[PDB]
Amino acid sequence: HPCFNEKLHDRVGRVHVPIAPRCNIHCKFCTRDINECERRPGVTGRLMTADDAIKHVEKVKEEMPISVIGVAGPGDALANEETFEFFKKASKKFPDLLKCMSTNGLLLPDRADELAELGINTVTVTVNAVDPEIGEKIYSFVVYKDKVYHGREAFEVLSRNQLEGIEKLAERGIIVKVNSVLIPGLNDEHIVDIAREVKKRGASLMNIIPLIPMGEMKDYPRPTCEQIERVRNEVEKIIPVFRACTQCRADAYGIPGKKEAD
Ligand code: SF4
Ligand code: SF4
Ligand code: SF4
């Protein structure tokens, strides 16, 4: 799996299906939109249907290697009812490709059973904070069940559900990755605590990614390739760490060295 280790990243391939529009939370740096050509995390060039995603994976698996397929669509992959239809239709069409996902962890406590039934191998959870005094200044609102949270309670609900979901996915038998965005000034001296609690829950690999201030933030400075390495090596002594994150789009297909983007 190219998203793990660091060597297959230039040799193994993956597919992203833009099959998860609309999210259930609001991060202080989200853009999404269909900006055609842009290497943003949530910048899909064109949304697709579950069957169109099947056709896309089928048309790309022959002219490209492809080791995994992943639903890292614009919104939360658990927030869209098309991700599960995609994985169900793909479980019996190409059972050879590993099935990955990029979630926020909020809808993991109820959908861990469904992720296990769909044959999911790996799920990465975007954990950006665990101390409420830090996470209250990263998120705006969280819509859970049938109610919307917006203050410190929003982060409390989000963190509780995401951590319980990490534990549930680890107990069910699914390797979970932890993406954490290094925002200089908020969670810079906090990634080690995130690593402690996430490893206590059951994380295998952690992917520290630099902040891209292409969001609701007043363009904070990007964490220097020195501080991103200082925190990275300070965390490596608690949990294995990934070190080749190109911040892929939501429509990338192929090997992440010569990938396409619709
Ligand atoms: S989710 Fe993140 S890691 Fe898993 S496949 Fe899609 S991109 Fe690679
Ligand atoms: S999770 Fe992805 S989509 Fe939902 S808000 Fe944070 S960034 Fe925007
Ligand atoms: S996002 Fe980071 S981890 Fe997911 S694929 Fe692009 S690089 Fe590998």
Side-chain angles (χ1 to χ4, degrees), residues 1-4 9 13-18 20-27 29-32 37 39 41-42 45 47-50 53-54 56-57 60 65-66 69-75 77-79 83-84 86-87 90 94-103 105-112 116-117 119-130 132 134-135 138-141 149 151-152 154-163 165-167 170 172-176 178-188 190-197 201-208 210-213 215 219-225 227 229 232-233 235-236 239-242 244-246 248 250 252 254 256-257 261-262:
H1 191 207
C3 287
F4 285 70
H9 205 322
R14 61 96 197 286
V15 156
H16 286 174
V17 285
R22 190 262 206 284
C23 184
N24 50 11
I25 62 172
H26 184 237
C27 299
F29 55 93
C30 182
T31 41
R32 269 178 304 164
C37 320
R39 308 300 173 88
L47 297 174
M48 331 183 77
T49 324
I54 296 296
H56 181 40
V57 176
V60 78
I66 304 305
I69 59 171
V71 180
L78 292 174
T83 300
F84 301 155
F86 171 72
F87 282 122
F94 29 89
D96 51 349
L97 301 174
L98 317 177
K99 293 173 207 46
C100 199
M101 272 179 48
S102 164
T103 184
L106 184 61
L107 290 170
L108 272 170
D110 49 6
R111 298 288 190 177
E117 290 181 355
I120 300 300
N121 295 111
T122 303
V123 176
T124 166
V125 172
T126 308
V127 176
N128 299 323
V130 292
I134 301 188
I138 296 172
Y139 300 98
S140 310
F141 66 90
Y149 309 98
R152 211 184 202 254
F155 176 77
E156 291 169 346
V157 172
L158 179 61
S159 95
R160 195 180 45 255
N161 284 333
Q162 79 186 3
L163 296 169
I166 294 172
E167 212 160 13
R172 266 58 166 187
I174 294 171
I175 300 172
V176 47
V178 174
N179 291 85
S180 293
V181 180
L182 180 61
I183 301 162
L186 293 174
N187 56 4
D188 49 351
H190 187 68
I191 301 297
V192 292
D193 314 348
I194 296 172
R196 297 165 187 177
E197 198 138 345
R201 299 299 181 122
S204 303
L205 187 64
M206 190 170 179
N207 187 1
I208 285 84
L211 174 62
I212 295 174
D219 272 48
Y220 294 106
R222 85 101 60 81
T224 65
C225 278
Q227 176 63 317
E229 195 75 2
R232 194 102 56 97
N233 296 323
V235 171
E236 193 177 314
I239 186 166
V241 182
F242 189 72
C245 183
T246 68
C248 292
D262 286 330

CSV table of all heavy atoms in Angstrom, one decimal, residues 1 3-4 14-16 68-72 100-102 122-124 179 248-249, ligand 1, unseen atoms left out:
chain,number,residue,atom,x,y,z
A,1,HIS,N,0.8,-1.2,0.0
A,1,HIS,CA,0.0,0.0,0.0
A,1,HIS,C,0.9,1.3,0.0
A,1,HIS,O,1.6,1.5,1.0
A,1,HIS,CB,-0.9,0.0,1.2
A,1,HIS,CG,-2.0,1.1,1.1
A,1,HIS,ND1,-2.6,1.6,2.3
A,1,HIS,CD2,-2.6,1.7,0.1
A,1,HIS,CE1,-3.5,2.5,1.9
A,1,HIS,NE2,-3.5,2.6,0.6
A,3,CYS,N,0.3,4.3,0.5
A,3,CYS,CA,0.1,5.3,1.5
A,3,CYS,C,0.7,4.9,2.8
A,3,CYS,O,0.7,5.7,3.8
A,3,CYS,CB,-1.4,5.5,1.7
A,3,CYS,SG,-2.2,6.5,0.4
A,4,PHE,N,1.2,3.7,2.9
A,4,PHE,CA,2.0,3.2,4.0
A,4,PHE,C,3.5,2.9,3.6
A,4,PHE,O,3.8,3.0,2.4
A,4,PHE,CB,1.4,1.9,4.6
A,4,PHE,CG,0.2,2.2,5.4
A,4,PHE,CD1,-1.0,2.6,4.8
A,4,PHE,CD2,0.2,2.0,6.8
A,4,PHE,CE1,-2.1,2.8,5.6
A,4,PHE,CE2,-0.9,2.3,7.6
A,4,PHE,CZ,-2.1,2.7,6.9
A,14,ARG,N,-2.7,4.0,-6.8
A,14,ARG,CA,-4.0,4.1,-6.1
A,14,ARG,C,-5.0,4.9,-7.0
A,14,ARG,O,-4.6,5.6,-7.9
A,14,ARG,CB,-3.8,4.8,-4.8
A,14,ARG,CG,-3.3,6.2,-4.9
A,14,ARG,CD,-4.4,7.2,-4.8
A,14,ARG,NE,-4.0,8.5,-5.3
A,14,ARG,CZ,-3.2,9.4,-4.7
A,14,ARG,NH1,-2.7,9.0,-3.5
A,14,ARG,NH2,-2.8,10.5,-5.2
A,15,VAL,N,-6.2,4.8,-6.6
A,15,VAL,CA,-7.3,5.5,-7.3
A,15,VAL,C,-8.2,6.2,-6.3
A,15,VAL,O,-8.5,5.6,-5.2
A,15,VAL,CB,-8.2,4.6,-8.2
A,15,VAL,CG1,-9.6,5.2,-8.4
A,15,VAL,CG2,-7.5,4.4,-9.5
A,16,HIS,N,-8.5,7.5,-6.5
A,16,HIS,CA,-9.5,8.2,-5.8
A,16,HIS,C,-10.7,8.4,-6.6
A,16,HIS,O,-10.6,8.8,-7.8
A,16,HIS,CB,-8.9,9.6,-5.4
A,16,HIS,CG,-7.9,9.6,-4.3
A,16,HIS,ND1,-7.3,10.7,-3.9
A,16,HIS,CD2,-7.5,8.6,-3.5
A,16,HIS,CE1,-6.4,10.4,-2.9
A,16,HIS,NE2,-6.6,9.1,-2.6
A,68,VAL,N,-4.4,0.1,-4.6
A,68,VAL,CA,-5.6,0.4,-3.7
A,68,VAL,C,-6.5,1.3,-4.5
A,68,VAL,O,-6.2,2.0,-5.4
A,68,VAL,CB,-5.1,1.1,-2.4
A,69,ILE,N,-7.8,1.3,-4.0
A,69,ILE,CA,-8.8,2.3,-4.4
A,69,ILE,C,-9.3,2.9,-3.1
A,69,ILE,O,-9.5,2.2,-2.1
A,69,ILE,CB,-9.9,1.7,-5.2
A,69,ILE,CG1,-10.7,0.6,-4.4
A,69,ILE,CG2,-9.5,1.2,-6.5
A,69,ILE,CD1,-11.9,0.2,-5.0
A,70,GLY,N,-9.4,4.3,-3.1
A,70,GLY,CA,-9.8,5.0,-1.9
A,70,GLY,C,-10.9,6.0,-2.1
A,70,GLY,O,-10.8,6.7,-3.1
A,71,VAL,N,-11.8,6.1,-1.2
A,71,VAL,CA,-12.9,7.2,-1.3
A,71,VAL,C,-12.4,8.3,-0.4
A,71,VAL,O,-12.7,8.3,0.8
A,71,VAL,CB,-14.2,6.6,-0.9
A,71,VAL,CG1,-15.3,7.7,-1.0
A,71,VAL,CG2,-14.6,5.5,-1.8
A,72,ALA,N,-11.6,9.2,-1.0
A,72,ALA,CA,-11.3,10.4,-0.3
A,72,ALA,C,-11.9,11.6,-0.9
A,72,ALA,O,-11.3,12.6,-1.3
A,72,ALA,CB,-9.7,10.6,-0.2
A,100,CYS,N,-9.6,1.7,0.6
A,100,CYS,CA,-9.2,2.6,1.7
A,100,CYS,C,-10.2,3.8,1.7
A,100,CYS,O,-11.0,4.0,0.8
A,100,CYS,CB,-7.7,3.1,1.4
A,100,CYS,SG,-7.0,3.9,2.9
A,101,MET,N,-10.0,4.6,2.7
A,101,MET,CA,-11.0,5.7,3.0
A,101,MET,C,-10.3,6.8,3.8
A,101,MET,O,-9.4,6.5,4.7
A,101,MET,CB,-12.2,5.2,3.7
A,101,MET,CG,-13.3,4.7,2.8
A,101,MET,SD,-14.7,4.2,3.8
A,101,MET,CE,-14.9,5.6,4.9
A,102,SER,N,-10.7,8.0,3.6
A,102,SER,CA,-10.3,9.2,4.4
A,102,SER,C,-11.5,9.8,5.1
A,102,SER,O,-12.4,10.4,4.4
A,102,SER,CB,-9.6,10.2,3.5
A,102,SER,OG,-9.5,11.5,4.2
A,122,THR,N,-8.2,-0.4,5.2
A,122,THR,CA,-7.5,0.7,5.9
A,122,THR,C,-8.3,1.9,5.8
A,122,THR,O,-8.9,2.2,4.8
A,122,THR,CB,-6.1,1.0,5.2
A,122,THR,OG1,-5.3,-0.2,5.2
A,122,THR,CG2,-5.4,2.1,5.9
A,123,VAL,N,-8.4,2.6,7.0
A,123,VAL,CA,-9.1,3.9,7.1
A,123,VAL,C,-8.2,4.9,7.8
A,123,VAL,O,-7.8,4.6,8.9
A,123,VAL,CB,-10.5,3.7,7.8
A,123,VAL,CG1,-11.1,5.1,8.0
A,123,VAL,CG2,-11.4,2.8,7.0
A,124,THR,N,-8.0,6.1,7.3
A,124,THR,CA,-7.3,7.1,7.9
A,124,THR,C,-8.2,8.2,8.5
A,124,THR,O,-9.2,8.5,7.8
A,124,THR,CB,-6.3,7.8,7.0
A,124,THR,OG1,-5.8,9.0,7.5
A,124,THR,CG2,-6.9,8.1,5.6
A,179,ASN,N,-3.9,11.2,10.1
A,179,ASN,CA,-3.4,12.4,9.5
A,179,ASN,C,-3.7,13.6,10.5
A,179,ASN,O,-4.8,13.7,11.0
A,179,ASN,CB,-4.1,12.7,8.2
A,179,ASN,CG,-3.7,11.7,7.1
A,179,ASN,OD1,-4.3,10.6,7.0
A,179,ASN,ND2,-2.7,12.1,6.3
A,248,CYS,N,-2.6,14.7,-1.7
A,248,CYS,CA,-3.3,14.3,-2.9
A,248,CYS,C,-4.7,15.0,-3.1
A,248,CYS,O,-5.3,15.4,-2.1
A,248,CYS,CB,-3.4,12.8,-3.0
A,248,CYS,SG,-1.8,12.0,-3.2
A,249,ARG,N,-5.1,15.1,-4.3
A,249,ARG,CA,-6.5,15.6,-4.6
A,249,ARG,C,-7.5,14.5,-4.3
A,249,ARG,O,-7.2,13.4,-3.8
A,249,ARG,CB,-6.6,16.1,-6.0
B,1,SF4,S1,-7.6,7.6,1.8
B,1,SF4,FE1,-5.8,8.9,2.0
B,1,SF4,S2,-4.5,7.1,2.1
B,1,SF4,FE2,-6.3,5.8,1.9
B,1,SF4,S3,-6.0,5.8,-0.2
B,1,SF4,FE3,-7.4,7.5,-0.4
B,1,SF4,S4,-5.6,8.8,-0.2
B,1,SF4,FE4,-4.3,7.1,-0.1
